């Protein structure tokens, strides 16, 4: 288990600076104890970022914090992330070309929505802060004169 940085606390807002969702903003719920990766959600109704796991080295801890208790994380453990993962077609399992992944997304889609009951609390709170919903849904960018060694979050 990694030791998370002191700036990363539950409910804080993080910026994803690498990977598929690069430049997006998310909300840090808790850390996967079985893998050490953060479990974040850039609430799907706002950013479209689903429930996922990201290593703490690919995120920046912003000072903006959504807090939010009663998040109802009863599921969303190492079982859930291993349940919705799309696995290959083994080696000796005939050929099963192309179609295997398309069916996988269809069958795992239902459980993905089911666990989005977590987002029901942060979404309501986020709209309370003026300009925050626009801030969350918008990509993070480095403008002119934005020197990273001078920026502070």
């Amino acid at each position: 288990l990694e030791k998370l940085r002191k700036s990363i606390v539950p409910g804080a807002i993080l910026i994803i600076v690498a990977g598929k969702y690069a430049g997006k903003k998310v909300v840090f719920l808790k850390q996967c104890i079985k893998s050490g990766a953060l479990i974040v959600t850039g609430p799907f109704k706002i950013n479209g970022v689903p429930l996922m796991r990201i290593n703490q080295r690919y995120v920046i801890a912003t000072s903006q914090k959504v807090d939010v208790s009663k998040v109802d994380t009863t599921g969303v453990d190492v079982k859930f992330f291993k349940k919705i993962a799309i696995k290959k077609a083994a080696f000796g399992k005939t050929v099963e070309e192309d179609f295997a992944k398309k069916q996988y997304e269809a069958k795992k889609a239902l459980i993905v929505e089911k666990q989005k009951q977590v987002d029901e609390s942060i979404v309501a709170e986020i709209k309370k802060v003026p300009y925050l919903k626009e801030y969350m849904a918008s990509y993070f960018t480095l403008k002119n004169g934005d020197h990273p060694h001078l920026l502070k979050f």
Partner: protein, 130 residues
């Protein structure tokens, strides 16, 4: 005729070092290159020291009745009596000094609203002109 001189009592502005953007008062002139600044350490925090004129800038204020080699105690009385801090903060440099401190504590969210808000205001102000 030149307006700002390097005299005794002239209020100067440190531009580099550990006391950058801090006010100081000239109390002695060693030669054409070095002056003795004693911007009251009890007020601004600039210790009595010799500095090169390349590191400071002049201002439009001169403290009244400052003699060369004035002590720190009497110098402090003349500094508050003139109210240099009150007068300096209303100048173009004075407001530029406080602006830099205001901007250096912004966060990413803070810069987000300002860029969004100012863009709309500037666009709207351009519309209003025929």
């Amino acid at each position: 005729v030149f307006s700002r001189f390097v005299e005794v009592g002239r209020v100067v502005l440190m531009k580099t070092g550990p006391f950058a953007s801090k006010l100081a008062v000239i109390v002695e002139i060693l030669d054409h290159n070095r002056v003795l600044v004693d911007g009251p350490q009890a007020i601004t925090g600039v210790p009595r020291q010799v500095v090169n004129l390349n590191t400071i800038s002049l201002t439009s204020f001169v403290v009244n009745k400052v003699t060369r080699g004035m002590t720190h105690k009497k110098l402090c009385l003349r500094f508050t009596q003139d109210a240099i801090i009150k007068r300096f903060n209303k100048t173009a440099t004075g407001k530029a000094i406080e602006k830099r401190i205001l901007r250096e504590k912004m966060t990413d969210f803070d810069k987000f609203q300002v860029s969004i808000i100012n863009r709309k205001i500037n666009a709207a102000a351009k519309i209003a002109v025929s």
